[PDB]
Ligand binder design. Structure first.
Ligand SMILES: Nc1nc2c(ncn2[C@@H]2O[C@H](COP(=O)(O)OP(=O)(O)OP(=O)(O)O)[C@@H](O)[C@H]2O)c(=O)[nH]1
Ligand SMILES: Nc1nc2c(ncn2[C@@H]2O[C@H](COP(=O)(O)OP(=O)(O)O)[C@@H](O)[C@H]2O)c(=O)[nH]1
Ligand SMILES: [Mg+2]
Lengths: 451, 445, 48
């Protein structure tokens, strides 16, 4: 009766789609072949799966999801894979050659060729829905398709669907790690495009999560397969309301009203607690308040910028499992009390709150263990201006030499657009800086007797 | 014969809706099938107040349910008592509200208010005499907030000479549940001050004190909170449904409790409230009610009314009470708190006393006060507004619905006027005679 | 062009004094006259 569309773009995106849908079947009791475990009727009514899967056939549940990369490998490994009977083959879309870490290939000379093919299958999945809520879109900034084909797709999505929300869900590039040299150019050339077209973006970071995997989770040798399974436990908790009833409910069109004080500042960071082995949960009790304070510790944040380095503007709490609303109100009030947990000096009502009755299930035999209660959190903060400044500095150092430029400009893209993308991010640095000002409107600042 | 319409709107509004419809139905021995089974003949007597008759001993409530999504109402329809309701009266969107009050008042609630007024025309014309509408909504919310404002904007002129009784959960005194709370609330009151006859202010943070202090709960749910405001709603409307020794209905309550046409913001309170243990370690009497009924920490607004002055009070008792023992405790309060009432309104209390107590109680009282203290809420709401509006933050989601950036300031100007009205009456002096200069004159030396 | 923020938080700085609105009581102006003289002399008076 209301519905969501998911989109997986580039090898990050696809591999998270191959992690998230796995969880989504268990979270609904669906099987790896889109069946319920049984033919014969049990229980009565919902079947709360309508917002995620179209029901077909003898009660075969088809996930509401389109997949794109311009290499076929990554989608051929789903087409031949474990979940080969869950996904629909029209919705598994492949290219002939990857954008090869080049935005101009991603966005133009290769990416142009299947944009209408992708959009028509998106049309066909929208015409399948009873009430479209909008789009959740998955990529990285590193990728040439994760940048090029995402940005192209969100331009097209605004033609076809106008005001309908478009929420981004993205592997934000790390502060000292990279897997690629040209990552800072693909990182800007997408952002320059999607700020004027998407409604939010919720960041998460490889190196941050690597740190948490080792420090907290006790995982010495973490994989991407842990990474994306921790990332699926994020977006399961951002979509718990759209899957279950709960004491407080938060729709896909809520989060933008809450988290976005001006359309330029639409880039929160996503955090989740607790993240530990079972072996550590036997020396803990994990109260509501405990886990809510754990979502603020700098060592627990899943974007690596330190939240001491700026000021909160906006927050959303997203609880699951054994949580009651008083316990939360007191967790929030005592974090609010801490003016070390500092908010921008204009923000009064900093928090939004969701509460689901249903706990997260985990995948069997794997690295993630059960808890009695859990919290995701989404927070917009001035402290991330150090990582945007990292994406400044990394662009500026190579672009002063015009290094790697000939790959993008050899796809016919222009030096003019390249410079405007950097200029839009020089405006973005002043956008973060102004929200950082304590609403100054004269020649100094003022105070009472004591703070 | 005398009748009420119920409306529920927004998540909180449909949760206090689903619990009020448990409370009142069980108080009538209405079964969850919608079958009448009341264990007194006096339950069937005024059943038309809250219900309409159907085929074969079935009844449906005169309750109308609104949303911009299916999701909350699905849990009504599946949850307990869900089957008393007429499924025609379920009026819900497939759109969301986004915590955007403009998305309700101007655009996507505007795409459905005509389907709500549809059910108001069907049900309100079951009534011999409609006395009023009873509306459970949000104020700081986006759903309930955004739906009641446009709805009253139409019910207040189809039915201009009926009453309009609102229960509104308000923004919290120390936290937020939603980011945009200051905006939704300031813009809702700008409509509702002009058009409501009664608004209770209901505060979770006040309720959560009670759950810690009087009820002594460890994991207090929303359900627990919802049983106390539905017990409030049942309580204030007890004399509408049963005999009493001192009757009153919504019209009798408003004329004693609203002294000027904007000063209809009320705090409730409820008595008794103890824990499941501590009940046994005090007595229960008229003074034991009163001991808790006036007591500022037990108000369901955390205003600590000893900051301000009561204009007017209403006390609505249930169970066999003795008139001299009630009348004299209402006055004992007034003398021994004489510094906490308005000057130019004496005899401050409207006392109503009804026969039939709650289910699982022998006595209770519902407390309704009017004190200029209530400025505490709306002041934070104004300060948390201009904090946001001095920079025009969040505005682009409201202009994205057509809302003019000027009506934010018409509301701020209205909030300055309204808040200043509590201050112009707080400790305001009376008209009496002045000073006279006089001294002795020489007669002898 | 050296670049600035694309946002502009200063705009409500155009808003007018104020500050606040009213107060106005519902029918009378008691003690606004601030306790100056209102009579002349005084004590014994006349007779013809
Ligand atoms: N967490 C995570 N990141 C991944 C995964 N696969 C790749 N990445 C990230 O994706 C970014 C690079 O993108 P690519 O892997 O080249 O994918 P692509 O978008 O298809 O690239 P093209 O060749 O341009 O199409 C880097 O930040 C990688 O760390 C994955 O499975 N999980
Ligand atoms: N008393 C109580 N408060 C609730 C309940 N559900 C939501 N709330 C509170 O109601 C206020 C309005 O929120 P909500 O009802 O979600 O807003 P809306 O649905 O957009 O109008 C917030 O303070 C919530 O925490 C409930 O069942 N009982
Ligand atoms: Mg690729």
């Amino acid at each position: 009766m209301r519905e969501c569309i998911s989109i997986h773009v580039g090898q990050a995106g696809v591999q998270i789609g191959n992690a998230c849908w796995e969880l989504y079947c268990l979270e609904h009791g669906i099987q790896p072949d889109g069946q319920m475990p049984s033919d014969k009727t049990i229980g009565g009514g919902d079947d709360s799966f309508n917002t995620f899967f179209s029901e077909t056939g003898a009660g075969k549940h088809v996930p509401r999801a389109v997949f794109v990369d311009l290499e076929p490998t990554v989608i051929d490994e789903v087409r031949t894979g474990t979940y080969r009977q869950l996904f629909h083959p029209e919705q598994l879309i492949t290219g002939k050659e990857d954008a090869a870490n080049n935005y101009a290939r991603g966005h133009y000379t290769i990416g142009k060729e299947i944009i209408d093919l992708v959009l028509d299958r998106i049309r066909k999945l929208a015409d399948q829905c009873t009430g479209l809520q909008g789009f959740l879109v998955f990529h990285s900034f590193g990728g040439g398709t994760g940048s090029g084909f995402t940005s192209l797709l969100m331009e097209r999505l605004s033609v076809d669907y106008g005001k309908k929300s478009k929420l981004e869900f993205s592997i934000y590039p790390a502060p000292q790690v990279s897997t690629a040299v040209v990552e800072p150019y693909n990182s800007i050339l997408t952002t320059h495009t999607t700020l004027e077209h998407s409604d939010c973006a919720f960041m998460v970071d490889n190196e941050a999560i690597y740190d948490i995997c080792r420090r907290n989770l006790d995982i010495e040798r973490p994989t991407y397969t842990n990474l994306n399974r921790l990332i699926s436990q994020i977006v399961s908790s951002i979509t718990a309301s759209l899957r279950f009833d709960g004491a407080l409910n938060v729709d896909l069109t809520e989060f933008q009203t809450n988290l976005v004080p001006y359309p330029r500042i639409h880039f929160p960071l996503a955090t989740y607690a607790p993240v530990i082995s079972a072996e550590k949960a036997y020396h803990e009790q994990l109260s509501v308040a405990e886990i809510t304070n754990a979502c603020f510790e700098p060592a627990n944040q899943m974007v690596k910028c330190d939240p001491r380095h700026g000021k909160y503007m906006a927050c959303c709490l997203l609880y699951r499992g054994d949580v009651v609303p008083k316990d939360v109100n007191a967790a929030i009030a005592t974090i609010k009390t801490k003016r070390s947990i500092q908010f921008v000096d204009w923000c009064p009502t900093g928090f939004k709150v969701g509460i689901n009755y249903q706990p997260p299930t985990v995948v069997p035999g794997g690295d993630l263990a059960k808890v009695q209660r859990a919290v995701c959190m989404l927070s917009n903060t001035t402290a991330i201006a150090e990582a945007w400044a990292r994406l400044d500095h990394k662009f500026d150092l190579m672009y002063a030499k015009r290094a790697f430029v000939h790959w993008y400009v050899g796809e016919g893209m222009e030096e003019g657009e390249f410079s405007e993308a950097r200029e839009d991010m020089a405006a973005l640095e002043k956008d973060y800086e102004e929200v950082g000002v304590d609403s100054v409107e004269g020649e100094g600042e003022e105070e009472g007797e004591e703070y | 014969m005398r009748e009420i319409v119920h409306i529920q709107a927004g998540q909180c509004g449909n949760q206090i809706g689903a619990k009020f419809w448990e409370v009142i139905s069980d108080e009538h021995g209405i079964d969850p099938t919608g079958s009448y089974h009341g264990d007194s003949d006096l339950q069937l007597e005024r059943i038309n107040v809250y219900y309409n008759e159907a085929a074969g001993n079935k009844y449906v409530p005169r309750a109308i349910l609104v949303d911009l999504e299916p999701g909350t109402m699905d849990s009504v329809r599946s949850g307990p008592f869900g089957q008393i309701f007429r499924p025609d009266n379920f009026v819900f969107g497939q759109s969301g509200a986004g915590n955007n009050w403009a998305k309700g008042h101007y655009t996507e609630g505007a795409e459905l208010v005509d389907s709500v007024l549809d059910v108001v025309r069907k049900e309100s014309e079951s009534c011999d005499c409609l006395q009023g509408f009873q509306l459970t909504h949000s104020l700081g919310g986006g759903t309930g907030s955004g739906m009641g404002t446009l709805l009253i904007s139409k019910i207040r002129e189809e039915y201009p000479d009926r009453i309009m009784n609102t229960f509104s959960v308000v923004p919290s005194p120390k936290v937020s549940d939603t980011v945009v709370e200051p905006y939704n609330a300031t813009l809702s009151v700008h409509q509702l001050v002009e058009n409501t006859d009664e608004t209770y202010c209901i505060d979770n943070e006040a309720l959560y004190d009670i759950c810690f202090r009087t009820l002594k709960l460890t994991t207090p749910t929303y359900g627990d909170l919802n049983h106390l405001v539905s017990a409030t709603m049942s309580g204030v409307t007890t004399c509408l449904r049963f005999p009493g020794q001192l009757n009153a209905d919504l019209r009798k309550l408003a004329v004693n409790m609203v002294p000027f046409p904007r000063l209809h913001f009320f705090m409730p309170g409820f008595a008794p409230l103890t824990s499941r243990g501590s009940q046994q370690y005090r007595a229960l009497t008229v003074p034991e009610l009163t001991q808790q009924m006036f007591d500022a920490k037990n108000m369901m607004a955390a205003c600590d009314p000893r900051h301000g002055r009561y204009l007017t009070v209403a006390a609505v008792f249930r169970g066999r009470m003795s008139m001299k023992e009630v009348d004299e405790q209402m006055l004992n309060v007034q003398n021994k708190n004489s510094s906490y009432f308005v000057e130019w309104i004496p005899n401050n209390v409207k006392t109503a006393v009804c026969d039939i107590p709650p289910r699982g109680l022998k006595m209770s009282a519902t407390f309704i006060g009017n004190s200029t203290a209530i400025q505490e809420l709306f002041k934070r709401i104004s300060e948390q507004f201009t904090a946001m509006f001095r920079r025009k933050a969040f505005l682009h989601w409201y202009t994205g619905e057509g809302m003019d950036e000027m009506e934010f300031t018409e509301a701020e100007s209205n909030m300055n006027d309204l808040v200043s009205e509590y201050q112009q009456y707080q400790d305001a002096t009376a008209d009496e005679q002045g000073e006279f200069e006089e001294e002795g004159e020489e007669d002898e030396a | 062009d050296r670049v600035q923020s694309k946002i502009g938080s200063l705009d409500n700085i155009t808003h007018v004094p104020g500050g606040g609105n009213k107060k106005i009581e519902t029918h009378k102006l008691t003690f606004r006259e601030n306790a100056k003289a209102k009579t002349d002399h005084g004590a014994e008076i006349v007779y013809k």
